[PDB]
């Protein structure tokens, strides 16, 4: 899963806040 991917965490933080 891209979930555990360190390179995708900032993208998830941006999507979760939006």
């Amino acid at each position, epitope marked *: 899963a*891209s979930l555990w991917n*360190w*390179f995708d*965490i*900032t*993208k998830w933080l*941006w999507y979760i806040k*939006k």
Partner: antibody
Amino acid sequence: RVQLVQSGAEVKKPGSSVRISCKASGGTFSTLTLTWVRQAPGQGLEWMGGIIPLLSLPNYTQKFQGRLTITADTSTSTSYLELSSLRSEDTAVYFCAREASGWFDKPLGAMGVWGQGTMVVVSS
Amino acid sequence: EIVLTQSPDTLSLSPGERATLSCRASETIRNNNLAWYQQSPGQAPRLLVYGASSTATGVPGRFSGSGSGTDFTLTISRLEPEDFAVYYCQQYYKPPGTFGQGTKVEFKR
């Protein structure tokens, strides 16, 4: 616009450690990745590791695990690299770089803003 | 660890000519998290292309990227004298991040 200013050049004896700083002028810092890249004299770029400051979450390539520490301070928008057990192969320019931001504010993964570099010479 | 192999090692061209640089990966870059950087002597690297094919803001329009899977290409449609430098590809798909070994664009003679 956004600029990363790094600390001055260093001369270190082998076996010692070095600490270098990277401060961002303005812009988003806590929710964007900050990566450290080094370049030995005459060779190419080497991705060492990075940190997500809000989560205090680092990630290091296996080559440096045990000698490398990357931290961040969100109040001053500053990141610190620390490399211990220095050897002659560690002589390089060390670059600080911040994740590029996209169409809305979408993190783009690539390194968009670069510091000016800090030269570290390992010599006795 | 994903290994990136650039080719050729040195590209020898003249101003006004077209430059085609290659970057091949050991593993499929499934979300096209591939970037290209430029570096001149004594200066920090500069981002040119992100997402395999999106040229960064402020980068001249003669730079463009293409490709997918394991084969990616940076094209400089018409070389200007300031374009004679070293270019690096880099993947940010799976940690750790990794660079290619670099390609030098030199003056033909």
